[PDB]
Amino acid sequence: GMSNKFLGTWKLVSSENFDDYMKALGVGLATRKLGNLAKPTVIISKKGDIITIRTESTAKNTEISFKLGQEFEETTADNRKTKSIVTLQRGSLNQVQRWDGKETTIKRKLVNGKMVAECKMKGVVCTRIYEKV
Ligand SMILES: CCCCCCCCCCCCCCCC(=O)O
Ligand SMILES: [Cl-]
């Protein structure tokens, strides 16, 4: 299952192309501003076979818990109600969210000790880099 090196508290240090990604998701302007300003903390933890990803920012927190490979209901930070599945592919922790026949992926991998998240909607790609605190 998931590498223990994912477990811990992660802080955003770099974001690329997040605004166009949020536009692809249908996010409104007020919320995009929040998203472009935020420098969230992402906390990855595991208990039994359940992984939890908790995101904290000044303006919004989110939290998901899941078993690898098992679909679950999710309410995203921009208030989409999705059905989501997290898988593991060659060390990459990959989240797919589906709603209304739409799909977006968030792939989280470790690179030189940093967590790199690739976000993709309709071919629009962003890259968000985190340092482990
Ligand atoms: C805490 C996020 C900031 C708040 C902005 C809310 C509107 C956009 C959120 C939708 C997708 C977020 C994907 C995050 C990927 C990551 O963990 O880097
Ligand atoms: Cl913040």
Residue numbers in the entry: -1 to 131
Text taken from the publication that reported this structure:
P2 belongs to the fatty acid binding protein (FABP) family, and the structure of P2 is typical for FABPs: the body of P2 is a barrel formed of 10 antiparallel β strands, and the loops that connect the β strands cover the open ends of the barrel. Inside the barrel, there is a large ligand binding pocket, typical for FABPs.
Phe57 lies at the tip of the β3-β4 loop, close to the bound fatty acid. The fatty acid, originating from the E. coli expression host, was modelled as palmitate. Phe57 lies close to the anion-binding pocket we observed previously.
